[PDB]
Every structure is written in C-alpha cells, then in structure tokens.
Amino acid sequence: KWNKTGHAVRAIGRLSSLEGGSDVGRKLIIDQNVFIEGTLPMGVVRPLTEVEMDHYREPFLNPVDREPLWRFPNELPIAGEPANIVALVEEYMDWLHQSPVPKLLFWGTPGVLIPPAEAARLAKSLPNCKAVDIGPGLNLLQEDNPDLIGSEIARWLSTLPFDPHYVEVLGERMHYVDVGPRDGTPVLFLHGNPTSSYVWRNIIPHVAPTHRCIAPDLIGMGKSDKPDLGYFFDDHVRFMDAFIEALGLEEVVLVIHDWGSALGFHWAKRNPERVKGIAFMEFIRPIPTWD
Ligand SMILES: [Cl-]
C-alpha cells in the first residue's frame, strides 16, 4: 500500500486526467509543489534537511517553472502509453541487451522504478554488467548511500559546492558541473526528475581525482534557463544532444539516473561507438501494466 502511494503520488497528474477525469493532479503538482514536497522526500529513505530541501526547492520556487515536474510523469512508459516513448525506450533496452559496453547497476530496497527483483534479473541478462546493492533506497539512491556509489564508480572506472560553468545550448544557457582532469575520457552525470546536478554532489568528489566529471542541469531545471516549453522528453533530447556537442565530447562514460537514464540510454543507442561505459540506477524501462 505505502509502496503504492509513492508511485501514485508521482503519477497523480496522469491518473487524475486519465482514470479520474480530473485536473486536481496538475493542481497539486503545479500549485502545491507536491512533486517537490512529496514525491522527492518519499524517494529517499533518510530524512532531508531543510538546507537540502531548499536546494531541491530552489529551481521551482515559482509555479510557472514547474512544467517539467508535471510533464515528466505524463511521459513515463506505462501500459504502452505514450506509444512514442514506449517504442523509444523499448528500442534502447534492446540495444542495451545486445551491447557489450561495460555496465554498472546500482539498486536499493525496495526501490521505486526498479524493484530489487527487477535489478537482479536485468543484471544477469545484460552483458558485462555488475550489480551493486546500496542497501536501503528508494529513487534517489545517491542521497541514501553516496559513499558506496561514489567509491564503486571510481573502482569501476579504474578497470576501464562546485563553481558554476555555463554553455549556450540552442539559444538557452545550461549550467553544469565540471571538475577533474582535462584529459582522458570524461564522465557525464545525468540527473532525473525532480532533481538537478545537486543529486550528484556527494558522488562527484569520489570520481574527481582521476576522471573529468560533467554534471549538467537539464533545461528548465536546476540553474539552467527555463523557457516556455512543454518540456516533453523530445525537448530534453534536443538540449542534451546539443549540450554534448557544445562541450566537444567525443567518447564518454555515462552515469545516469531516473529520466536522465532515458536520455543517456537514448543517446547511447544512437551513438554506441562513443560510449565507453554506463553506470545506471533507478532507470526508465517500459512498465507493462499499472498493476
Ligand atoms: Cl516522472
């Protein structure tokens, strides 16, 4: 039941329109900020300080800037809808099952998007994949066990409060973290909903002394510009594509989470020769039924 309310509140905007025929869900997300005040804390086992909540609250203080919080759950591949997202996601999960790229899967109990039984079955079926039990965790595993994730990523790469940096992307300014050495293969950290590069703040220090760490804020989120868009998945794809190109990235290691995993997997499927490794957690894959 309680595990179900978590998924229910995250999808309160979709279910209100679809099966309840009502707009209360959009009202709760846009006006009451339920995604920030509800879904986000219910995605972490440990309690969050008010300083931490304020960092997560900061990009969405104005309700007009909360469009991505509402559109993202409407894009989740659930029950075959939306059809274009499901086909997109099914396509990159087919590529992942075939790709020999080194993989590293973080998971927790009981998780949110990935139940423990799903993380284990997928870890066995994916080639060159290593699974890491972070212990207790829901959606934001980085906030429950950042030391293990940061340490395990650093070890995995060996076998292969930051200053703000900005780049203009398709007419918009996108903020990103950039630390570590200037040479070698960079590591790209893609956050999801409703977070920013802030969610990687305790993992990057573990990876910084040996590898470049690039952690951008998605358009409309974090310290990035927030134009008047619908913020569909296609919008995020266009901006992340141009972000990778604007930074001159050739080969890359991907560290992705939540909707950032959909972005990373969709980019990797279209640029497979440039992907040197994928570390992922609480990722986007098709959900057969609501049940
Ligand atoms: Cl979502």
Swiss-Prot record:
The cross-references to Pfam families, in alphabetical order and at most eight, read: Abhydrolase_1
Active site (record annotation): N139, D258, E282
A GO BP term here is: response to toxic substance
Source organism of this protein record:
Rhodococcus sp
The catalysed reaction is: 1-haloalkane + H2O = a halide anion + a primary alcohol + H(+)
Question: What GO terms fall under cellular component here?
Answer: membrane
Tell whether Transferase is among the UniProt keywords. Answer: no
The pathway noted for it is: Xenobiotic degradation; haloalkane degradation
Its Enzyme Commission number(s) read 3.8.1.5
Q: Which GO terms describe its molecular function?
A: haloalkane dehalogenase activity
| EC class (word) | hydrolase
What family does the Swiss-Prot or TrEMBL record give for this protein?
Belongs to the haloalkane dehalogenase family. Type 2 subfamily.
User: Record's InterPro entries?
Assistant: AB_hydrolase_1, AB_hydrolase_fold, AB_hydrolase_sf, Epox_hydrolase-like, Haloalkane_dehalogenase_2
Know the name of this protein?
Haloalkane dehalogenase
